[PDB]
Amino acid sequence: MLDAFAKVVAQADARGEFLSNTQIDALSKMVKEGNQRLDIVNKVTSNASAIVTNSARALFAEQPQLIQPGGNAYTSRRMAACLRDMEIVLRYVSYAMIAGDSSVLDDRCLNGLRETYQALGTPGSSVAVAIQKMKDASVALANDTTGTPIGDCSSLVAELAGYFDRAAVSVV
Amino acid sequence: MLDAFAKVVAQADARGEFLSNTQIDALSKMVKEGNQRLDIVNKVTSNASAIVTNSARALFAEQPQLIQPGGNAYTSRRMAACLRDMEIVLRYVSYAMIAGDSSVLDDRCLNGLRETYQALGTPGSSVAVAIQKMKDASVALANDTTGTPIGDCSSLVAELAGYFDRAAVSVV
Amino acid sequence: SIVTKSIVNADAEARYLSPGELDRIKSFVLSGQRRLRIAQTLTENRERIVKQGGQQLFQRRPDVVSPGGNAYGEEMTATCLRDLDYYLRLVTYGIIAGDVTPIEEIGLVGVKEMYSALGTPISGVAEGIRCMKDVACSLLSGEDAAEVGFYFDYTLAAMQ
Amino acid sequence: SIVTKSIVNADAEARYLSPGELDRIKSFVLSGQRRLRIAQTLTENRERIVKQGGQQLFQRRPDVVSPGGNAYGEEMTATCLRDLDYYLRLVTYGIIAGDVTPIEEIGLVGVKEMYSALGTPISGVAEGIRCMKDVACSLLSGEDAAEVGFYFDYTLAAMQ
Amino acid sequence: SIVTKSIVNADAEARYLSPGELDRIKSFVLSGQRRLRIAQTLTENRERIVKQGGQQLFQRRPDVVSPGGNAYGEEMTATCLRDLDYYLRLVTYGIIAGDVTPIEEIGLVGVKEMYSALGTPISGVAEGIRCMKDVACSLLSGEDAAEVGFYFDYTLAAMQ
Amino acid sequence: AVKQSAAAKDTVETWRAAAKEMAAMRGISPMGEAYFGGIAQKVDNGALAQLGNKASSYKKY
Amino acid sequence: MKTPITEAIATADNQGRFLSNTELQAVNGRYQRATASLTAAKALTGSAQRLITGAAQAVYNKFPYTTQMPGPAYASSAIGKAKCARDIGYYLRMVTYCLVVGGTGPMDEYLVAGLEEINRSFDLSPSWYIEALQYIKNSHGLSGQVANEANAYIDYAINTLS
Amino acid sequence: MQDAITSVINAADVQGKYLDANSVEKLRGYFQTGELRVRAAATIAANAATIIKEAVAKSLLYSDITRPGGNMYTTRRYAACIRDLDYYLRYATYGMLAGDPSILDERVLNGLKETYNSLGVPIGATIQAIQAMKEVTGSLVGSDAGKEMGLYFDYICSGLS
Amino acid sequence: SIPILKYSLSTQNQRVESFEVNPGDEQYRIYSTDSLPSSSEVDQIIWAAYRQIFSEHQILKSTKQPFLESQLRFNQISIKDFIKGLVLSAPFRDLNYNVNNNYRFVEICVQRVLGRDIYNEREKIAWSIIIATQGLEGFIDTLLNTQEYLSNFGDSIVPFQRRRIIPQRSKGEMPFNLKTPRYGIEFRSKLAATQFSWASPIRRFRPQEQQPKAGDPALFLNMVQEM
Amino acid sequence: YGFSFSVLESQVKNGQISIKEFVRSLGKSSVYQKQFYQPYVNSRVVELAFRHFLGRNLSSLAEFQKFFAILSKKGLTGLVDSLINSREYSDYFNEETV
């Protein structure tokens, strides 16, 4: 597991030189944005169980055959497993937002998630539909200017949007 | 594990359809042959160790190269394993005769069994004739009328035959 | 197109084009402004026309997507929608060419040999194009829906 | 039969029948005793060959019998087995004629037009004949099962 | 390959192949088992050999990736690594062909005209292949690194 | 021809004893089931279409 | 699914023993009470559309807010009332699946396991479904031991929700 | 158009001599395999459509000749393939029965590679289709019969190259 | 009386040592009952036992074991008797034992219980006769009395996947819940008539002429974004 | 290619028209002229007509100019009717033999 600072340390550890004085200015620009980072995470971790169930409900109206009798997410054993499966993806996306780099997203979550949907028979294209349902709810809640000073945060919600559509192309 | 009743239900819940009136009667057909279904199994477990040792001796009246030095079933660990596997196969087909379909037979025993023996080096078709030495030691033992009165029950012993040759082609 | 087969018709007959042929090449090119608008509607609606096209196709033919169906799994279902994107594209060609000549020699000539040789139910793919037709004609007015639907049902006719 | 098309072959060529044609009419009529025994086995096994034929057909294609399938209900399922009784009958003709000429002009020529025009999945009826083939060849020895199965798979080939 | 130009050499001279030519076609085909192992190492190491190849290339030539460099931005840098994937592929061909004949008529003949006409510094792409060579020879033993590196430096020579 | 009427002229009659006991499996009481892997594919549940008949089945008289 | 047959099979390969006469009597008592069970599953399937639409109306008469509150969890829409009626279709279908196999196997597999996690995620009150099941329990019209078998799997569905 | 017996009779006739021991020695060798060839030609007739469906799906089904721009894109062009592959599996069956590949170059090979170059048909993908079709044909008829039927497939692939 | 089939070992990460004194970040969190937890910290052990022996799915209300949970909190049974109650739990039979055979169930009970991968495929053959002779309750206590269970878990540690990652690296191996799911491809494909008949919904429509061909620079844009 | 002339197979299988009628109507069809008339020259169309409607090549030079001028003036419908209505067709094939 790395954070954003660890990928600059461990890169030049393989090159073996000291960290340059123009690379410190890139790390100090990150800690100036370090407190706008912490309320993108606090906005999405607090409405976490309503990002999930409002995105599942939007999925099951577009593709109604996933919940009809003989469908994949039909029973009450497997509706709960489908609802869990978006909670785990939203968990590791917010983990990779607070670290700054995606090295824990594709390690404990996406490392072979595609190959276990071929074994389970789960439609992997429909999990990537319901991740982009959750991307549209989470970047709208990271623009919420209540209890926070007004400023430009467009470069950090575009990084949160990057970890959502990385986990969508890794299941199809 | 599904019995004969659960295989009707699992096919009807997958389509989301109730049970019809003429499908209730075919399961009510099964329970008036209920004593005849049960006392077949009261033969084949009560003479069960006789069926093993009669067939295992008579296999080497047919293929004595297994007990040859260098052969597969030569040694006393391996002779104890050949009577082991014929005791297990006789055990699961008694479970399917009390069920009514072979779903406990090909989920426990026969699933992935050819690839065991080819990785073991055991001759595949040469254990299938040991199963067919147990069927005629049991379907003749089922037609014996000790203690029970007389009625036409050739339909049930065909299914008792029908498990022994479903199991015979799964090891070849 | 109407221009190329009105020529090859009069070509074979050793003659020039009659007023009946030249008052329609004339009538077709003045129709050309309205044709590009119609094809422009279907061009950037392929996301909905195809995806909702395969919507009704699976609800009407669950066999083809069920286990054992030809388009079963994540793989075949993607190709299951790929063909609909093909046939939706050829209808855009037929609308601009003013004829099913583009649809004729692409996706229609010998189509039963392909789908029979692929194991695909040819009646099933015909059901898919009909589902796309209701989505397409729902995107246009009545004067246009008599055209865009008009090319689909020709594809329905030749596909069975 | 082999007798009628070995004639119409040599008929068209303005010639008589060669030894290659007359040593096979000869070889076929001495085969005639064994053919009637084979057809006699399938004749009064139609109760099991058809009913077990539709056994595996529904287990392999539950769509056709499910609600919405072509053979849904008490009515269509009876006709669902009626066609299998037809094709099982034509195989008895082909075995005695020594050729699929009876099966050719009955149940094969233009069969796709009928079943496409009836809404029946032609691939589904092909699955039905294959299920009958395993029941039929299970009723005969190896020397016979290379024939009785041999006529079914021709019907499978022409039915797709 | 060594087989095709040992032929076209003796072809032009109106003669057959000498022992010097036929004891090397012989010596090359017995070498063929060891060549496929070497090319098999570079085949599924292109992820590291290319990505670490462009690693040292940018650290040694930051001008080409800096603003104003030819490979500037997300776009050109992707194509910046695409060419290295090309030349790494041709080296796998040269190892199996036992000669730079595949590398000769692909990626070497007239290469200066292309890169001069694309605005790319041809010396810069030569630096890229050298960085790939140190990664490639680090993946193999000394007996192999005298070959895999041997084809890179030929590409270095012709690329300047 | 009148001696052969109504029994031997009906080729679908001989399988009516089996095709309406083969087709008495998984009946559906409300509207909606036979979901078939998760699609709609519903029911008609009337007296006619529970026997699978159509408008071309009483009009054949 | 847990039937009386498949639990008699299950204790055999617990020990890895053969099927003795400590399991043939378990299948024997199942065949006694299956003649008062399939006469109950026939009558619940035959009057299924009467029971389902009568049980949707018993919820709406007791809880009239559900027919008029806005929001997705309530049956105040057209599609809210259809999702309510198929839920009571699902609760009646698992009762007649449990009467056929003679045990609580199908509703353990399909209804019960995971039920709390979807009634909490979709804001469905479990007192709605007890009122939908209490209408069925004393208005199926059965009489006797055929009634006594339907009032043990409806009552098993209630005690999960209660 | 000569079979093994026709070729043996021709060479023995072209020298004006009778059928000596060497000419009949090969003829006896052909009659020994007469039983194998008919059963080989039997199953190939049965699974003609299945073999061609297996070859195209195994060799060139998803390659970009199948996609737009590829040599097999339009339905007329796709339908010409299975029509075209049917001749290779059919004429190879004739060579397997006749025991002599004279019928192939007489009726298939001549003007074939010169025709595909005219149409622009890729000879590379064609041979791999026949190679894959040869691979499935060895599945049905067995090993030695596949060796016989396979011996005429590569004859087509060699001359078509 | 029939000893086990003498299989062979292989090369793995758990049978060497790490030289990791003061291990930094990827430690897999030894929950234990010798650290004397509080009643809110017994609850963080019981969730780790449910996540290890089941997956993260089957921690439902019906799959909890509320009488086995109370005997852990009274210190009546150990962790080793608590893992044995979870494999013999009736949710673990009908969800993870009825849907695969004996040669895949050994791959579950060595990946989750022992925390290591299987050595080779003969070990699945060598272990699967224990389940068919004396049962699943005879299979777990001969798997919990091995030296690989006692020498790094003992009587007080909930097990874990030992040495999943290499300490200078960041990729490592696959987690075992994402390695072996509830059922495999061989149980799913054989039941496509009764169960598992779903047919797949429609993918997002990508047009065919926008797909990259050999020699396109759009096949290297994922390489350039990793620079 | 799944082509179909159901009307012509109708009128020939019943005997309403000859094979010669069925062959001539096939020649004036549009699936023919799209196949063997459009992609070629009137020069090459004349020789490809003889291979189809006569089963032989052109014989002389004057046999070309007689049949090129006909195709030159009446196209496909004038050429194929001038081959089917010749004597050489009738001597080999009259009304029944393909």
Ligand SMILES: C=CC1=C(C)[C@@H](Cc2[nH]c(/C=C3N=C(/C=C4\NC(=O)[C@H](C)[C@H]4CC)C(C)=C\3CCC(=O)O)c(CCC(=O)O)c2C)NC1=O
């Ligand atoms: C542990 C809890 C914890 C938090 C929740 C944050 C909360 C937080 N954010 C800011 C400070 C800020 N917070 C924002 C954030 C936003 N403005 C917007 O318009 C967006 C809606 C939103 C984030 C997406 C900005 C833009 C600033 C800096 C003000 C500026 O530079 O203009 C500050 C003041 C810091 C300072 O004065 O230096 C604090 C305490 N930090 C924490 O430690």
Ligand SMILES: C=CC1=C(C)[C@@H](Cc2[nH]c(/C=C3N=C(/C=C4\NC(=O)[C@H](C)[C@H]4CC)C(C)=C\3CCC(=O)O)c(CCC(=O)O)c2C)NC1=O
């Ligand atoms: C513990 C297990 C167990 C049993 C096996 C049965 C034993 C049993 N079988 C029968 C009764 C019967 N049992 C049989 C069975 C047979 N008769 C034959 O000739 C064949 C050898 C054999 C079937 C293959 C038949 C046919 C009857 C009915 C008697 C009749 O036909 O009149 C009866 C009398 C009442 C009844 O019908 O149930 C009993 C107690 N009951 C049990 O509790």
Ligand SMILES: CCC1=C(C)/C(=C/C2=NC(=C\c3[nH]c(/C=C4\NC(=O)[C@H](C)[C@H]4CC)c(C)c3CCC(=O)O)/C(CCC(=O)O)=C2C)NC1=O
């Ligand atoms: C380590 C982190 C982690 C990942 C990445 C993970 C994936 C994962 N998803 C699973 C199941 C599942 N996933 C789904 C999800 C869906 N099916 C659908 O129809 C929808 C399209 C979609 C979501 C809405 C379902 C229904 C199952 C249950 C499989 C079953 O019981 O049949 C399973 C099997 C049981 C489970 O643990 O949930 C795994 C292992 N599990 C993990 O523990």
Ligand SMILES: CCC1=C(C)/C(=C/C2=NC(=C\c3[nH]c(/C=C4\NC(=O)[C@H](C)[C@H]4CC)c(C)c3CCC(=O)O)/C(CCC(=O)O)=C2C)NC1=O
């Ligand atoms: C799911 C139920 C189940 C089955 C069916 C099963 C089979 C099974 N049979 C085995 C071995 C064996 N099986 C045989 C049996 C035979 N070899 C012969 O030559 C004869 C044909 C035949 C005896 C009549 C022998 C000799 C071995 C020992 C192989 C060895 O130890 O090297 C082994 C290897 C472990 C061992 O017993 O040593 C397995 C896993 N295991 C199961 O759990």
Ligand SMILES: CCC1=C(C)/C(=C/C2=NC(=C\c3[nH]c(/C=C4\NC(=O)[C@H](C)[C@H]4CC)c(C)c3CCC(=O)O)/C(CCC(=O)O)=C2C)NC1=O
């Ligand atoms: C422009 C005219 C045109 C068409 C139409 C066309 C079709 C076409 N469909 C294909 C496959 C396929 N097509 C389907 C289609 C379906 N499955 C179903 O259940 C449905 C009924 C149906 C779609 C609505 C499937 C499943 C495959 C893959 C078959 C296999 O993998 O064996 C393939 C082979 C793979 C490929 O190259 O794409 C081609 C060439 N090509 C063309 O040039």
Ligand SMILES: CCC1=C(C)/C(=C/C2=NC(=C\c3[nH]c(/C=C4\NC(=O)[C@H](C)[C@H]4CC)c(C)c3CCC(=O)O)/C(CCC(=O)O)=C2C)NC1=O
């Ligand atoms: C001797 C050659 C021959 C055949 C084969 C034949 C078929 C034939 N099948 C028919 C109907 C039918 N056939 C089916 C068949 C099926 N449904 C399925 O799901 C299955 C896939 C399939 C059977 C295995 C159905 C459902 C009908 C009734 C269709 C309707 O009522 O609209 C009918 C119309 C009713 C009748 O007159 O019987 C004919 C003529 N006729 C012939 O002369």
Ligand SMILES: CCC1=C(C)/C(=C/C2=NC(=C\c3[nH]c(/C=C4\NC(=O)[C@H](C)[C@H]4CC)c(C)c3CCC(=O)O)/C(CCC(=O)O)=C2C)NC1=O
């Ligand atoms: C197999 C032999 C072979 C080669 C080598 C080859 C090269 C090649 N390089 C190209 C572009 C390019 N190549 C570069 C390369 C570089 N920029 C730098 O700073 C570096 C010095 C260097 C790479 C290490 C750039 C930036 C472009 C895009 C130029 C532009 O967009 O104007 C293009 C045009 C786009 C394309 O079709 O890919 C071709 C054809 N083609 C071939 O067939």
Ligand SMILES: CCC1=C(C)/C(=C/C2=NC(=C\c3[nH]c(/C=C4\NC(=O)[C@H](C)[C@H]4CC)c(C)c3CCC(=O)O)/C(CCC(=O)O)=C2C)NC1=O
């Ligand atoms: C077979 C086992 C099984 C059960 C128990 C089950 C319950 C279930 N009920 C649901 C919804 C629902 N259930 C209701 C039901 C009601 N609301 C009311 O106002 C009425 C009082 C009441 C009952 C008549 C409504 C309105 C929804 C939609 C809520 C939403 O989508 O947010 C959903 C969400 C998905 C959907 O169907 O749209 C599930 C999973 N599903 C199953 O597969």
Ligand SMILES: CCC1=C(C)/C(=C/C2=NC(=C\c3[nH]c(/C=C4\NC(=O)[C@H](C)[C@H]4CC)c(C)c3CCC(=O)O)/C(CCC(=O)O)=C2C)NC1=O
């Ligand atoms: C009996 C000996 C014999 C052969 C073999 C033969 C071949 C032959 N192949 C043709 C076309 C064709 N052949 C193909 C074949 C292919 N496309 C591919 O990508 C594959 C590599 C290949 C399938 C294996 C295609 C696509 C056409 C149509 C070309 C066009 O429309 O331009 C044509 C043009 C006319 C027509 O098909 O009606 C002839 C004459 N003729 C003969 O007399």
Ligand SMILES: CCC1=C(C)/C(=C/C2=NC(=C\c3[nH]c(/C=C4\NC(=O)[C@H](C)[C@H]4CC)c(C)c3CCC(=O)O)/C(CCC(=O)O)=C2C)NC1=O
């Ligand atoms: C069954 C008995 C057994 C074997 C056979 C075994 C092999 C083994 N060698 C390993 C690593 C290694 N092996 C080497 C050795 C070398 N690399 C070099 O560059 C040198 C050329 C060479 C030695 C001079 C290195 C450096 C690592 C660690 C890789 C790393 O952590 O970066 C690892 C990875 C785990 C670890 O860090 O220890 C295993 C499992 N381990 C065992 O327990």
Ligand SMILES: CCC1=C(C)/C(=C/C2=NC(=C\c3[nH]c(/C=C4\NC(=O)[C@H](C)[C@H]4CC)c(C)c3CCC(=O)O)/C(CCC(=O)O)=C2C)NC1=O
């Ligand atoms: C364009 C004007 C036109 C018509 C109408 C026409 C009819 C026509 N109908 C025919 C046969 C036929 N027509 C039928 C029709 C029917 N059987 C019934 O029971 C129904 C009452 C009826 C369907 C409505 C049948 C069964 C044959 C085949 C007769 C046979 O094989 O003996 C034939 C014999 C050749 C063939 O079909 O290939 C011709 C020529 N030809 C024409 O040029």
